[PDB]
Every structure is written in structure tokens, then in C-alpha cells.
Amino acid sequence: TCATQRLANFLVHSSNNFGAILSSTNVGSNTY
Amino acid sequence: TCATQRLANFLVHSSNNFGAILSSTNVGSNTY
Amino acid sequence: TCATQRLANFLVHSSNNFGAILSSTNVGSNTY
Amino acid sequence: TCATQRLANFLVHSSNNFGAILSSTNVGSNTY
Amino acid sequence: TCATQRLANFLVHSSNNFGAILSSTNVGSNTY
Amino acid sequence: TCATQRLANFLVHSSNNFGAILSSTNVGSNTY
Amino acid sequence: TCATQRLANFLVHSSNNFGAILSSTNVGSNTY
Amino acid sequence: TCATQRLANFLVHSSNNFGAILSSTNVGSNTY
Amino acid sequence: TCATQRLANFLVHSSNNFGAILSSTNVGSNTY
Amino acid sequence: TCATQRLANFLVHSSNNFGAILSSTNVGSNTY
Numbered sequence: 001t002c003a004t005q006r007l008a009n010f011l012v013h014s015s016n017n018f019g020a021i022l023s024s025t026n027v028g029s030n031t032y
Numbered sequence: 033t034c035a036t037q038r039l040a041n042f043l044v045h046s047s048n049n050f051g052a053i054l055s056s057t058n059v060g061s062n063t064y
Numbered sequence: 065t066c067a068t069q070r071l072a073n074f075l076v077h078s079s080n081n082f083g084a085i086l087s088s089t090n091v092g093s094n095t096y
Numbered sequence: 097t098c099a100t101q102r103l104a105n106f107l108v109h110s111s112n113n114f115g116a117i118l119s120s121t122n123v124g125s126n127t128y
Numbered sequence: 129t130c131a132t133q134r135l136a137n138f139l140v141h142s143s144n145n146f147g148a149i150l151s152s153t154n155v156g157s158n159t160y
Numbered sequence: 161t162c163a164t165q166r167l168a169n170f171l172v173h174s175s176n177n178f179g180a181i182l183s184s185t186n187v188g189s190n191t192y
Numbered sequence: 193t194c195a196t197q198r199l200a201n202f203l204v205h206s207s208n209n210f211g212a213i214l215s216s217t218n219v220g221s222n223t224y
Numbered sequence: 225t226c227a228t229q230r231l232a233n234f235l236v237h238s239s240n241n242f243g244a245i246l247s248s249t250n251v252g253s254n255t256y
Numbered sequence: 257t258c259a260t261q262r263l264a265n266f267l268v269h270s271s272n273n274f275g276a277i278l279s280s281t282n283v284g285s286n287t288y
Numbered sequence: 289t290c291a292t293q294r295l296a297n298f299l300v301h302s303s304n305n306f307g308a309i310l311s312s313t314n315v316g317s318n319t320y
Contacts, residue, residue: 001130002036002132004034006038007038008040009041009042010135011042011139011141012044013044014044015064016048016144016268019050019095019146020052020150021052021053022229023227024225025057028060029063030158031159032160040071044272045075045078047078049081055087055089055226056257057091058090059092059093064143065247067214067278068099068100068101069244070101072102073104076240080113082170084165087118087119087163087195089120094125094126113172119163133310138306144268151258152257162194163193167202168200170204182212191222193225194228196228201233201235203236204235204237204238205238206239210241216247217248220250223254224241227258228262233264234268235268238269238272241272242275243275249281249282251283253287255287256288259289259290260290260293261292261294264296267299270304272305273305275307278308278310280313283309284314285319286318287317287318
């Protein structure tokens with residue numbers, strides 16, 4: 001029995017949920 | 033019995049849920 | 065018995081659910 | 097018995113459900 | 129029985145949740 | 161013009177895709 | 193023009209994709 | 225123009241992707 | 257123009273991705 | 289123009305990614 005782990009380039013570029021842009025705001029952007 | 037793991041380029045570019053753009057806002061953007 | 069895992073380019077470009085664009089907003093965008 | 101996994105380019109470009117565009121909004125966009 | 133771990137380039141470039149841009153703000157940006 | 165949102169019990173009990181059960185495994189389970 | 197948001201019980205009990213059960217494993221479980 | 229936000233019980237009980245159970249392991253569990 | 261935010265019980269009980277249980281391990285558990 | 293923020297009970301009980309349980313370990317637990 002042996003246990004060798006070789007994980008390369010694990011990535012989660014997560015940008016998931018709610019974004020609140022509300023009032024009187026003409027926005028050139030992209031909010032997380 | 034052996035256990036070798038070789039995972040390359042695991043990725044979840046998640047941008048999932050609710051986006052709130054509400055009122056009086058002409059927005060050139062893309063909110064997460 | 066052996067266990068070798070070689071996973072390459074796992075990806076879920078998830079952008080799934082509800083998007084709330086509400087009132088008085090002429091929006092050139094694409095909200096997540 | 098052996099277990100070799102070689103998965104390449106797993107992808108789910110999911111953009112599934114409800115999109116809420118409500119009132120007084122002439123929108124050039126595509127909301128998730 | 130042996131336990132060798134060789135993990136390379138573990139990464140989570142997480143920028144997940146709520147972003148609050150509220151009022152009278154024409155913003156060229158991208159807030160986390 | 162008004163914008164009132166009253167959403168109750170939004171749900172997506174998603175368990176969608178590929179399930180990999182491979183070899184020499186009599187499994188009493190249900191894998192996501 | 194007004195913007196009132198009253199969202200209650202937003203939920204996504206997501207358990208979506210690939211599950212890897214490979215070899216010589218009689219498993220009473222349910223892996224995400 | 226007004227911007228009032230009243231969001232209650234925002235939830236994403238996400239447990240989404242790959243689960244790796246590999247070899248010689250009779251497991252009573254449920255791994256994320 | 258006004259900007260009032262009243263957000264209650266924002267929650268993401270996220271337990272998303274890869275779980276590595278490898279070899280010679282009969283495990284009563286649930287690993288994140 | 290006014291900016292009032294009243295956020296109550298902001299929470300992200302995040303326990304997301306990789307969990308490494310490897311070899312010769314019968315574990316009653318739940319590792320983050």
C-alpha cells in the first residue's frame with residue numbers, strides 16, 4: 001500500500017454571487 | 033494496492049447567481 | 065489493484081441563475 | 097484490476113434559469 | 129505503507145460574493 | 161414606475177452530470 | 193421611480209457533476 | 225428615485241463537483 | 257435619490273469541490 | 289443624495305475545496 005499525490009494547477013477562479021448596483025450610477029466596470 | 037493522483041488544470045470558473053441592478057442606472061459593465 | 069488518476073482541464077464555466085434588472089435602467093451589459 | 101482515469105476538457109457552460117428584467121428598461125444586454 | 133504528498137500550484141483565485149455600488153457614482157473600476 | 165421584487169423559495173436542487181463508477185466496486189450508495 | 197427588493201429564501205442546493213469511485217471499494221456512502 | 229434593498233435568507237448550499245474515492249476503501253461516509 | 261441597504265441573513269454554506277480519499281481507508285466521516 | 293447601509297448577519301460559512309485522506313486511516317471525523 002502506497003499513497004502518492006501529485007496534483008498540479010488546482011484552480012477555482014470563483015466569482016459567484018450577488019452583485020448590488022443600485023441607483024443613479026452609470027458604471028463602466030465589473031464588480032465582484 | 034497503490035494510490036497515485038495526477039490531476040492537472042482543475043478549474044471551476046464559477047460566476048453563478050443573482051445580480052442586482054436596480055434603478056436609474058444605465059450601466060456599461062458586467063457584474064458578478 | 066492500482067489507482068492512477070490523470071484528469072486534465074476540468075472546467076465548469078457556470079453562470080446559472082436569477083439576474084435582477086429592475087427599473088429605469090437602459091443597460092448595455094451582461095450581469096451574472 | 098487497475099483504475100486509470102484520463103479525462104480531458106470536462107466542461108459545463110451552464111447558464112440555466114430565471115432572468116428578471118422588469119420595468120421601464122430598454123436593455124441592450126444579455127443577463128445570466 | 130507510505131505517505132508521500134507532492135502538490136504543486138494549489139490555487140483558489142476566489143473573488144466571490146456581494147459587491148455594493150450604491151448611488152450617484154459613475155465608476156470605472158472593478159470592486160471585490 | 162415602481163420595482164418591487166418578492167421572490168420566495170427559489171430552489172434548484174441540481175445534481176446533473178457524469179458519475180464515474182469504474183471497476184471491482186460493489187457499491188451501495190448514490191454518488192453525485 | 194422606486195427600487196425595493198424583498199427576496200426571501202434564495203437557495204441553490206447544487207451538487208452537480210463528476211463523481212469518481214474507482215476500484216476495489218465497496219462503498220456505503222454518497223459522495224459529492 | 226430611491227434604492228431600498230431588503231434581502232432575507234440568501235443561501236447557496238453548494239456542494240458541486242468531483243469527488244475522488246479511489247482504491248481499497250470501503251467507506252461509510254459522504255465526501256464533499 | 258437615496259441609497260438604503262437592509263440585507264439580512266446573507267449566507268453561502270459552500271462546500272464545493274474535489275475530495276480525495278485514496279487507499280486502504282475504511283472511513284466513517286464526511287470530508288470537505 | 290444619501291448613502292445609508294444597514295447590513296445584518298452577513299455570513300459565508302465556507303468550507304470549500306480539496307480534502308486529502310490518503311492511506312491506512314480508518315477515520316471517524318470530518319476534515320476541512
